[PDB]
Amino acid sequence: TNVHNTKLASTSAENAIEKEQITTFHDVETPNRIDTPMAQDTSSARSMDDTHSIIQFLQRPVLIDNIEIVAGTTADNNTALSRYVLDRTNPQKYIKQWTLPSTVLKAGGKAQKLANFKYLRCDVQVKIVLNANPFIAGRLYLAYSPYDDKVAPERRIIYTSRAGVTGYPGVELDFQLDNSVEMTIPYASFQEAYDLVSGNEDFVQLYLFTIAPVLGPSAESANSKVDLSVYMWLDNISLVIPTYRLNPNL
Amino acid sequence: TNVHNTKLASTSAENAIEKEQITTFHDVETPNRIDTPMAQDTSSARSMDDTHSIIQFLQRPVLIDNIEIVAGTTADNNTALSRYVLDRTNPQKYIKQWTLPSTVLKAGGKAQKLANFKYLRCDVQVKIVLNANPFIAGRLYLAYSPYDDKVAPERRIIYTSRAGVTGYPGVELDFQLDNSVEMTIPYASFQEAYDLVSGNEDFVQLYLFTIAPVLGPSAESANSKVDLSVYMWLDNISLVIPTYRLNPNL
Amino acid sequence: INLSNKTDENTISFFDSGDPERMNNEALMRGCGEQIVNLRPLLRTFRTINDNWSLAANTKTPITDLTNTADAEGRDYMSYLSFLYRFYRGGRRYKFFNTTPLKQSQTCYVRSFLIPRNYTADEINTDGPSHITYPVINPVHEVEVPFYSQYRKIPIASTSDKGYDSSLMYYTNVGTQQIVARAGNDDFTFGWMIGTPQLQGITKEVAN
Amino acid sequence: WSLAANTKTPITDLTNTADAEGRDYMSYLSFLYRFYRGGRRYKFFNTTPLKQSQTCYVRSFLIPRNYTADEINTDGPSHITYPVINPVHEVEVPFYSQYRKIPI
Amino acid sequence: PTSENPKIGPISEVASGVKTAANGIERIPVLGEIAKPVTAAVKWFADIVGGVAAIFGW
Amino acid sequence: VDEMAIGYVCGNPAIKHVLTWSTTDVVQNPISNGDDWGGVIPVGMPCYSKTIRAVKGSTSKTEVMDPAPCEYVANLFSYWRATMCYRITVVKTAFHTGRLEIFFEPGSIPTVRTADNLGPDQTQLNGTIAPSDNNYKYILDLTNDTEVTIKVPYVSNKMFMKTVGIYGAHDEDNWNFDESFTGFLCIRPITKLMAPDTVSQKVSIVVWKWAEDVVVVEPKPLTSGPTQVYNPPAVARDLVKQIDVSMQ
Amino acid sequence: VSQKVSIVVWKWAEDVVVVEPKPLTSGPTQVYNPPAVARDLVKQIDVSMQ
Amino acid sequence: VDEMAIGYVCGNPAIKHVLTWSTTDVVQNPISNGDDWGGVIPVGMPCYSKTIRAVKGSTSKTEVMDPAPCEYVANLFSYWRATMCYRITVVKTAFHTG
C-alpha cells in the first residue's frame, strides 16, 4: 500500500463534496490525491512582510491631485467664496472637484482588486498636505456635498451662499495653522451597497473652496504661491459577492 | 469648542506621524480631522457574504483546459506512453502540458490581484474531473517534472522511458476507478520566492500522459471518447513586498 | 465505480451569509413596518370587486349576480387565493359604498337580507335577519353573512345540491351605484392546496 | 388644488412643486438634509364651490413614487370619504421602500 | 410594547401555543394557531353550558 | 396543517425548466435546448416566463405567464425578499455521465429584447464572455447522482426586490425586470454528456422552484393592471376576457 | 508679507428657545432657487386662498 | 446623532463675515473693507444681510438673504431667545501683528 511519489487508482467513499473558496465539486468518489509527504515552506516570503488583504490594499493612500495656487490670479482656484449666488451663470468657484467614490476606485490599482466583485460598502478617507512658506497666508474650506450632481440646483453646494457652503460638513484649512487636514466621508449611498458593475453612480462630491485667497507680498514674485497634494483611500470596506462582469470605466 | 459639521483651524501636537497601511505621513502638527459623529454601517454587505482576501481569491479553482480524447485516433493525445525513447525526434507523447505557475497566474483574474506585488510563494493545486460512460476504459498518468524546460534533455520526463515517466510524482487516473484526481505541486523554485516582475520563469511542468489509450467498441462511433476538464488554483500563499511595476505578460 | 442511478440528496447554500430571519426583520423595520406571514389576513382585508355596480329600483338582487363574475377574474383576494384551493368555510363580509349620482326619492334606503346561494329572488322570502342603511347619513352598508351551511366545507366547484349555504340579497328603493368591497369574517378560510393557474398580463392591440 | 372628475391624480403632481418652494416644514427643513425615511400624512379639506353630483366621494390609493396613474392599478389599500359628511380625508402613506433611506 | 396611544392596538390579542417561524416552510398545525374547541371557549356555547338567562330570553 | 401560510404555499415546488442536454452541447455553453429560458434561471420569486397569445381579425397580443406557487403569491405584493431554492434533477440512466456547472451571477441578466417578450442572450453566456471562475457554483457529477438542491440566499443592494418580473417587459420596458431578480443561475456543461449508442443521446434537466425565508412588503401589486387569472378560451379564435377598471 | 489680513467670523447659537411656529414675515418661508440666466425672473408662490 | 435637534442645527457654524484689515485702517474705526456689514456684527439669530437682485424689462427688485443654520431655523418662528457665539479668526502669518 505504502508507495512513494505516486497515487495509484483505487476506490473511495461513494459521495464526495469538496468545497474550495466558492467552487464546490461533487465527485462520484473521493478524488485520488497525491500530496507532498512531510511538506515544508521553502520560501522566505512570510518572513519579509505580512500578506496584505484586499481591504488593506484599498486602505493604501493614493495621490489623486497636486494643485498649485498662485497669488494675484483671477482664476477659479484663487478667487474666493462669494457671499451670494443670485444666478447659475455666476456660481461658487472651487479649486478642484472630485466625484466619489469613483476617483478612488479608479486610482492606485484599486480597480484591479475590486474586479470580479459586485457590491461594495466603504468610507472614503481624505488627507491634504499643504505647504506654504511662513510669508504666505490664506484659508481654504474642504467640504463634501452628497448627491450634488443629482440633486436639484437650489440644493447644491454650488449655487448657494458662503454661509451655506460653510454650513456643509468640512474642514477649515489655514496655511499657517493647518498645514494638513483629514476628512472621513461616510458611505453615502441610499442603497445597501455600491454596485461596482451595473451602476457607475457617484453619491458624494468633494469640493475645495477658497475663503481667503493667497495673501502674499505686493511685489510680484513666483514664490507667492502654495502647493497642494490630495491623498485618498477607503475605510470600513466590504467586498462580498463575486461576479464575472467588470466595469470598463475602471 | 463644541461645533458640528465642521472642524475649525487649530494648533495641535507639534510632531505627528500617521501610518496607513504602507504610506507613513509625517506632519508638522496633528492634522485637523473631521469624522462622522456616532458613525454607523448603513449597508448590508457584511451580512451578504464574507469579505474575501487575496489569498482566498487565489485559492479559487479556475478552469484551465477542456480536453476530449476520441478512440481510434493516432494523435498525440491518444497514442500511449512508449517503453523506450532512443532519440529526441521520437519522444514521449502527452495529452496536454502546463507551464507552472504561470498558467494559473494568467487565469481567473489572478494577475489583477497579484499586481503591485513583487514576491510570491505558493503551491499549485490541480483537480481533473474526467467523465467516460461505463463502456469506455483507459488509464492516464498525471505527473509533474520540475525544471523540465531548463534541465538537460537526458534529465527530462520527455526523452525518458515509461518506467522513468511513471517514476515521477504523479497520480494514476483510470476512467472507471478514478473519475477525478487531485494533485498538490509544491513551491518548486530554488530561490526564496517567485519574482512576479523581473523573472517570468517557470519551475515545474505538468504533464498528462497516456498509459492505455481509450478502449472502446470496435464499431466506429462518436460516443467512444472521454472528456476532461482541468482545474487549478494556488495554496500556501504569501504576497509580501509592494511595487509599482507589472509583468505585461500577465 | 458502481453502475447506479441514485440520489444522494445533496444541498448547497451559497454566500456565507447571516441569518435570514434576523436580516429580514432588520429590513422590515426599515422599509415595510409589518410582516405578512399568512394569507387569511388578506381574506380579512376588504378589497373591491366592482367599483361601480348599478342596480334597478325596487329590485331584490342576489349578490351571486356579481360574485360569480368576480370569482373568475382574480382581482380580489377571495378570488385570487381561491385558485390555490378547492374548499372553503366561514362567512363573508360585504361593504357597499354609495356612488349614486342622481336623486330619485326624498328618502333613499338600502336593505339586505339572507338568501341560499345560487337561488333567485323569486325563490326566497324577504324574511329573516336584515340590515337597513340610509346612504345620505350612512353611505356604507357593512353587512355580514354567517356560515349557515349543511356542510362543514363548501367546494368552489359546482354541486348537485342547491341552497346549502347562505348568501346575500340586496334591495334598493332607488337606482343606486355602489363600490362593492368584500372580505371574509373572522372564521373564513380556504381549503387544501393545489396548483396555480396561468396569469393574464398586458394586452397590446397592434395594427397589423 | 383643483382637480378634474374621474381622474386619478398622483400627489407628486403637487409635491414636486411644493418641495422646491420651502413653504411647509417638510420642504423648508429638507434643504438642510439629504436623506429621509418614514411615511407621510396628507389632509384634504374640501373647498368645492359647485355641486356636480348628488353623491360626491373622495378616494385614495397607493402608488410608487414618480409613477403615473396609467402605470399602476387601482388595487391595494384605499380610503374613501364623503366631503358632505366628512370634508377632510386624512389618509396616511406608509414607508413601503426597497431602501432604508430615500434621497431628496 | 412602546405606543403613544392609550390603546396599544385595535383588538385584544389571544395567545396561540404554536412554536415555528410563521413565514417558514415547516408545516405548522392550524389547531394551535387558534384554539376553539367545543367548550366554553366560544361565547355562545359557554352561555349554553352555563345556562345563562339570555338564551331563554331574559 | 395551516395551508394558507406563506411558507406552505411558497414551499410547494413546481417545474419551471425542463431542458434537453444533448451529446452535442458544448462545454461552458448554457443548455438552451428544450425550453423558453434555456440554461438561465432568474433567481427570484416573481415570474420570469411568459408567452404571447395572438388573435387576428388587427392583433391583440395577450401575454400569459407560468407561475409557480411562489410566483403566484409574490404577484399580490410590490416588493419581495426571500431565499430561492432549486432542485435541479436530471433524467438519465446508469450509463449517462457528465459534469454540470450551476453558477450564480448577480445583477442583470443578458437579455435579447423583443417587442412583446424578453429572453436570454446565449451568446453572452459562454465560457469566453462569461467565465465562471469568479462565481459561486456547484459542479455536479452525473456518474451516479442526478440532483442537487441549490439554495440562493438573498443578496442585493436593495432590502427588497420588485415583484413585477416579466409583466409588461419588452424592448422599451426592461428596468423592472432587472430589478425583480437578484441574479441568475446558468447550467453549463463542464464535460460533454457521455452516452453510449445503447441509451438516449439526450437527458432531461428538470428544475423545481420554491422559496424559503419569505417576506412580502405591501399588499398592492406593482403591475399596470390588477391581478388577473387567465381563463383559457375554448377556441383559438376567441378573444380573452378583460375586466372593467373604469371607476365610473 | 501681505499688507492685509482677512478676518473670518463664524456664527452659531447656544441655549436656544423658539416661541411660536409661525413666521413674522409678510410672506411665507421661501427658498431662493437661483435662475439660470440673470434675465430670468424668480418664482413666486401662489398665496391666493381661492 | 439626532441631527434634527435645534442645538445641532443652530450649533453648526457658518461664515458670515470675511473682512479685510489693511495697514491703512485707522485705530478705533470699524474694519469696513471687504464685506457688506463691515465691522458691525448684529448680535442675533435672524439674518441681518441681504442683497437685491434686480431684473429690468420696469424692475422687480427681489431681495436675497444669506442665512446660517441658526438663521434658517429662526425664520420659521416669530420670536427668539439665545446665546450668540462668534469665532473671530484672522488669516495672517507669524509676521503680522496688531
XYZ file of N, CA and C in Angstrom, chain A residues 33-149:
351
model
N -5.871 11.824 -4.463
C -4.893 12.888 -4.370
C -3.493 12.315 -4.203
N -2.506 13.069 -4.670
C -1.125 12.916 -4.233
C -0.662 14.256 -3.696
N -0.281 14.275 -2.427
C 0.248 15.458 -1.799
C 1.718 15.207 -1.476
N 2.406 16.261 -1.104
C 3.816 16.126 -0.780
C 3.953 15.560 0.629
N 4.754 14.513 0.829
C 4.929 13.964 2.179
C 5.842 14.832 3.033
N 5.369 15.153 4.235
C 6.092 15.998 5.179
C 6.541 17.291 4.504
N 5.546 18.046 4.055
C 5.783 19.257 3.297
C 6.404 20.342 4.168
N 7.061 21.288 3.502
C 7.711 22.410 4.154
C 7.387 23.683 3.390
N 7.677 24.819 4.016
C 7.664 26.113 3.344
C 9.117 26.498 3.100
N 9.576 26.287 1.870
C 10.959 26.506 1.487
C 11.205 27.913 0.967
N 10.335 28.853 1.302
C 10.482 30.245 0.928
C 10.686 31.103 2.168
N 10.908 32.394 1.927
C 11.102 33.377 2.981
C 10.099 34.516 2.903
N 9.045 34.370 2.104
C 8.109 35.466 1.909
C 7.372 35.803 3.198
N 7.041 34.792 3.999
C 6.362 35.029 5.265
C 7.252 35.707 6.291
N 8.555 35.766 6.045
C 9.488 36.451 6.922
C 9.794 37.870 6.472
N 9.485 38.210 5.222
C 9.812 39.525 4.687
C 8.778 40.567 5.088
N 7.501 40.229 4.969
C 6.420 41.141 5.310
C 5.162 40.315 5.518
N 4.093 40.988 5.917
C 2.802 40.351 6.072
C 2.055 40.359 4.746
N 1.234 39.338 4.547
C 0.450 39.211 3.328
C -0.780 40.096 3.448
N -0.831 41.142 2.635
C -1.901 42.115 2.725
C -3.161 41.590 2.053
N -4.304 42.004 2.585
C -5.592 41.624 2.039
C -6.058 42.673 1.038
N -7.252 42.463 0.491
C -7.842 43.463 -0.387
C -8.284 44.671 0.421
N -8.789 44.444 1.632
C -9.172 45.555 2.494
C -7.958 46.404 2.832
N -6.810 45.766 3.051
C -5.588 46.517 3.307
C -5.125 47.257 2.064
N -5.157 46.590 0.912
C -4.754 47.230 -0.331
C -5.585 48.473 -0.608
N -6.895 48.393 -0.388
C -7.773 49.529 -0.624
C -7.617 50.618 0.422
N -6.943 50.335 1.527
C -6.659 51.321 2.555
C -5.359 52.065 2.304
N -4.738 51.855 1.160
C -3.474 52.498 0.853
C -3.726 53.897 0.303
N -3.088 54.929 0.851
C -3.261 56.270 0.287
C -2.740 56.353 -1.137
N -3.498 57.045 -1.981
C -3.148 57.262 -3.376
C -3.156 58.759 -3.636
N -2.105 59.251 -4.281
C -2.063 60.641 -4.705
C -3.020 60.857 -5.866
N -4.025 61.694 -5.649
C -5.063 61.955 -6.632
C -4.746 63.198 -7.451
N -4.353 64.280 -6.785
C -4.161 65.563 -7.438
C -3.056 66.334 -6.736
N -2.372 67.176 -7.507
C -1.404 68.132 -6.984
C -1.756 69.494 -7.562
N -2.185 70.405 -6.702
C -2.625 71.731 -7.112
C -1.572 72.744 -6.695
N -1.481 73.826 -7.464
C -0.568 74.924 -7.174
C -1.315 76.226 -7.411
N -1.698 76.899 -6.333
C -2.399 78.172 -6.417
C -1.373 79.289 -6.312
N -1.428 80.229 -7.248
C -0.529 81.373 -7.272
C -1.313 82.612 -6.874
N -0.649 83.514 -6.162
C -1.282 84.737 -5.711
C -1.349 85.754 -6.839
N -2.344 86.628 -6.757
C -2.554 87.635 -7.771
C -3.048 87.048 -9.071
N -4.020 86.145 -8.975
C -4.584 85.473 -10.134
C -6.095 85.503 -9.994
N -6.779 85.950 -11.039
C -8.238 85.929 -11.060
C -8.747 84.642 -11.695
N -8.242 83.531 -11.183
C -8.620 82.202 -11.625
C -9.556 81.583 -10.602
N -10.269 80.547 -11.036
C -11.256 79.928 -10.165
C -10.606 79.333 -8.926
N -9.322 78.985 -9.006
C -8.654 78.378 -7.863
C -8.310 79.403 -6.791
N -8.043 80.650 -7.175
C -7.695 81.687 -6.212
C -8.863 82.591 -5.859
N -9.782 82.825 -6.788
C -10.926 83.676 -6.496
C -11.737 83.067 -5.362
N -12.240 83.923 -4.482
C -12.708 83.473 -3.189
C -14.161 83.024 -3.256
N -14.688 82.668 -2.094
C -16.043 82.167 -1.958
C -16.985 83.354 -1.804
N -18.054 83.362 -2.592
C -18.891 84.541 -2.752
C -20.037 84.570 -1.751
N -20.293 85.764 -1.210
C -21.346 85.933 -0.214
C -22.688 85.438 -0.732
N -23.067 85.847 -1.937
C -24.336 85.447 -2.518
C -24.114 84.784 -3.868
N -25.132 84.046 -4.297
C -25.209 83.479 -5.635
C -26.624 83.749 -6.122
N -26.775 84.730 -7.002
C -28.088 85.112 -7.487
C -28.483 84.373 -8.750
N -27.515 83.880 -9.516
C -27.792 83.210 -10.773
C -26.825 82.047 -10.932
N -27.191 81.109 -11.803
C -26.353 79.946 -12.062
C -25.212 80.238 -13.025
N -25.308 81.301 -13.825
C -24.167 81.735 -14.620
C -23.062 82.350 -13.775
N -23.245 82.419 -12.463
C -22.344 83.106 -11.551
C -22.200 82.277 -10.282
N -21.828 81.009 -10.382
C -21.857 80.131 -9.215
C -20.591 80.277 -8.379
N -20.523 79.481 -7.318
C -19.353 79.494 -6.459
C -18.181 78.819 -7.153
N -17.005 79.415 -7.003
C -15.798 78.906 -7.628
C -15.062 77.995 -6.661
N -14.444 76.953 -7.206
C -13.755 75.961 -6.402
C -12.412 75.647 -7.039
N -11.500 75.146 -6.212
C -10.166 74.805 -6.684
C -10.185 73.492 -7.453
N -10.810 72.465 -6.885
C -10.863 71.163 -7.526
C -12.070 70.418 -6.983
N -12.683 69.619 -7.849
C -13.831 68.799 -7.502
C -13.493 67.335 -7.746
N -14.094 66.463 -6.941
C -13.832 65.033 -7.001
C -15.142 64.275 -6.915
N -15.414 63.448 -7.918
C -16.534 62.524 -7.851
C -16.121 61.322 -7.018
N -16.907 61.016 -5.997
C -16.583 59.911 -5.125
C -17.693 58.872 -5.135
N -17.356 57.590 -4.944
C -16.001 57.094 -4.684
C -15.187 56.782 -5.941
N -15.717 57.106 -7.123
C -15.054 56.743 -8.375
C -13.584 57.138 -8.372
N -13.299 58.395 -8.034
C -11.939 58.912 -8.094
C -10.943 58.068 -7.316
N -11.413 57.208 -6.420
C -10.547 56.312 -5.673
C -10.559 54.908 -6.260
N -11.733 54.428 -6.666
C -11.823 53.140 -7.339
C -10.999 53.114 -8.618
N -10.817 54.265 -9.258
C -10.057 54.385 -10.499
C -8.643 54.881 -10.252
N -8.034 54.478 -9.141
C -6.756 55.039 -8.740
C -5.974 54.015 -7.935
N -4.654 54.054 -8.092
C -3.766 53.228 -7.303
C -3.892 51.744 -7.525
N -4.421 51.320 -8.666
C -4.607 49.906 -8.908
C -5.661 49.270 -8.038
N -6.641 50.050 -7.589
C -7.706 49.516 -6.756
C -8.780 48.824 -7.577
N -8.975 49.255 -8.822
C -9.926 48.587 -9.698
C -9.503 47.159 -10.001
N -8.200 46.887 -9.974
C -7.719 45.531 -10.190
C -8.154 44.599 -9.072
N -8.274 45.117 -7.853
C -8.673 44.312 -6.708
C -10.176 44.303 -6.499
N -10.861 45.373 -6.890
C -12.315 45.408 -6.864
C -12.942 44.612 -7.992
N -12.163 44.239 -8.999
C -12.685 43.470 -10.113
C -13.185 42.113 -9.644
N -14.212 41.615 -10.332
C -14.823 40.326 -10.038
C -15.579 40.346 -8.719
N -16.020 41.529 -8.323
C -16.856 41.728 -7.155
C -18.002 42.650 -7.530
N -19.166 42.402 -6.947
C -20.396 43.059 -7.355
C -20.798 44.207 -6.439
N -20.658 44.049 -5.126
C -21.145 45.024 -4.164
C -20.012 45.506 -3.269
N -20.106 46.769 -2.859
C -19.118 47.404 -2.001
C -19.785 48.338 -1.004
N -19.227 48.390 0.202
C -19.559 49.401 1.199
C -18.243 49.926 1.738
N -18.038 51.235 1.644
C -16.764 51.811 2.031
C -16.952 53.276 2.389
N -16.147 53.726 3.336
C -15.954 55.133 3.618
C -14.673 55.606 2.948
N -14.663 56.875 2.549
C -13.543 57.475 1.837
C -12.798 58.348 2.829
N -11.495 58.130 2.944
C -10.650 58.909 3.828
C -9.826 59.846 2.953
N -9.822 61.136 3.277
C -9.101 62.139 2.500
C -8.070 62.818 3.388
N -6.862 62.992 2.854
C -5.821 63.774 3.504
C -5.196 64.733 2.505
N -5.135 66.007 2.878
C -4.496 67.052 2.089
C -3.275 67.548 2.850
N -2.116 67.530 2.198
C -0.890 68.100 2.745
C -0.593 69.364 1.958
N -0.765 70.507 2.604
C -0.450 71.803 2.034
C 0.884 72.299 2.568
N 1.573 73.090 1.752
C 2.848 73.673 2.136
C 2.925 75.091 1.603
N 3.210 76.032 2.500
C 3.285 77.443 2.165
C 4.275 78.104 3.106
N 5.247 78.813 2.543
C 6.283 79.416 3.355
C 5.654 80.330 4.403
N 6.404 80.686 5.448
C 5.805 81.448 6.550
C 5.337 82.836 6.162
N 5.601 83.285 4.939
C 5.216 84.615 4.494
C 3.959 84.622 3.641
N 3.310 83.477 3.465
C 2.074 83.371 2.702
C 0.956 82.984 3.652
N -0.206 83.595 3.456
C -1.383 83.339 4.262
C -2.548 82.983 3.355
N -3.619 82.515 3.970
C -4.789 82.094 3.232
C -5.587 81.090 4.021
N -6.751 80.755 3.476
C -7.659 79.841 4.148
C -8.559 79.179 3.120
N -8.595 77.855 3.144
C -9.459 77.059 2.292
C -10.506 76.351 3.139
N -11.520 75.818 2.467
C -12.567 75.036 3.111
C -12.813 73.792 2.272
N -12.480 72.633 2.821
C -12.772 71.361 2.182
C -14.120 70.860 2.679
N -15.069 70.717 1.761
C -16.410 70.270 2.089
C -16.854 69.235 1.071
N -17.781 68.380 1.491
C -18.382 67.384 0.620
C -19.891 67.558 0.585
N -20.449 67.436 -0.615
C -21.875 67.576 -0.858
C -22.426 66.275 -1.419
N -23.312 65.579 -0.715
C -23.871 64.348 -1.274
C -24.891 64.642 -2.359
N -24.864 63.818 -3.403
C -25.834 63.889 -4.491
C -25.856 65.264 -5.145
N -24.740 65.988 -5.057
C -24.689 67.344 -5.590
C -24.961 67.359 -7.088
N -24.511 66.330 -7.800
C -24.738 66.251 -9.233
C -26.133 65.757 -9.579
